[PDB]
Scaffold this active site. Sequence first.
Site, mmCIF file in Angstrom:
data_model
loop_
_atom_site.group_PDB
_atom_site.id
_atom_site.type_symbol
_atom_site.label_atom_id
_atom_site.label_comp_id
_atom_site.label_asym_id
_atom_site.label_seq_id
_atom_site.Cartn_x
_atom_site.Cartn_y
_atom_site.Cartn_z
ATOM 1 N N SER A 152 -0.197 6.086 -5.333
ATOM 2 C CA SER A 152 0.139 6.735 -6.520
ATOM 3 C C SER A 152 0.509 5.599 -7.601
ATOM 4 O O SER A 152 0.766 6.135 -8.825
ATOM 5 C CB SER A 152 1.404 7.693 -6.207
ATOM 6 N N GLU A 203 -8.209 11.996 -2.156
ATOM 7 C CA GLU A 203 -9.002 11.281 -1.421
ATOM 8 C C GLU A 203 -8.694 9.918 -1.528
ATOM 9 O O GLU A 203 -9.275 9.045 -0.667
ATOM 10 C CB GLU A 203 -10.317 11.349 -1.800
#
Length: 262
Positions: free
Chosen positions: A44, A142
């Site tokens: 992230s 993914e």
Amino acid sequence: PETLVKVKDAEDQLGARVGYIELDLNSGKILESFRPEERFPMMSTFKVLLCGAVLSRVDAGQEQLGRRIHYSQNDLVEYSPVTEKHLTDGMTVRELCSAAITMSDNTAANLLLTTIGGPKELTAFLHNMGDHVTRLDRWEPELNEAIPNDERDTTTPAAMATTLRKLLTGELLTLASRQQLIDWMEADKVAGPLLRSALPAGWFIADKSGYGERGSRGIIAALGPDGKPSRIVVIYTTGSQATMDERNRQIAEIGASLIKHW
């Protein structure tokens, strides 16, 4: 020497590589480093570069923060805690970046990827601002797979640190875009147990955390005393079998040391 010792000790205790950069926000020069030219999954932490690419488009008039995006329940990927609540009303580009940085929303990251033309276009934005190392190849979720020796969706500590510095303080973004990007990061709500756990009262911090498969964990931050950021810290790790709690603690201890020896 204490901080590089904590990093090396973290590697031993985690059974895994740890990458580290402490950078001078003003001069942009590295103060300390470990495995600076090794690749690690961004997870992230890429959401900050994504929003920088969106802000560069906002500056150029190719995008507008108040533009509304509507989407359906069928666009929702795992971990979409903000986007799942705006199915009838949609979200503005501003709200999506807020959700992507402050809550790590995956569906917000994918909707923003679509606005810029996808992972290859984020990679092109980075190349064009001088980062020919960082690469995004896949979408959420993914991109967090963290296959060993797979270079997809990776940075190096050094490239990420210098790129974050360029986004927050460099000549690329408008003053208003730079402020919005670091404001979103100051409002992070999903990095509680990491560098923030080491931060003394009065200190400023703007950050973005990440976690993925195979022990992947990391954080990018701008931090400093007296309410103002003065240095950039990047910490990444991948390959450990350690729990999330231990990985968090190791990062917090690297933080405690760099703050003690500021």
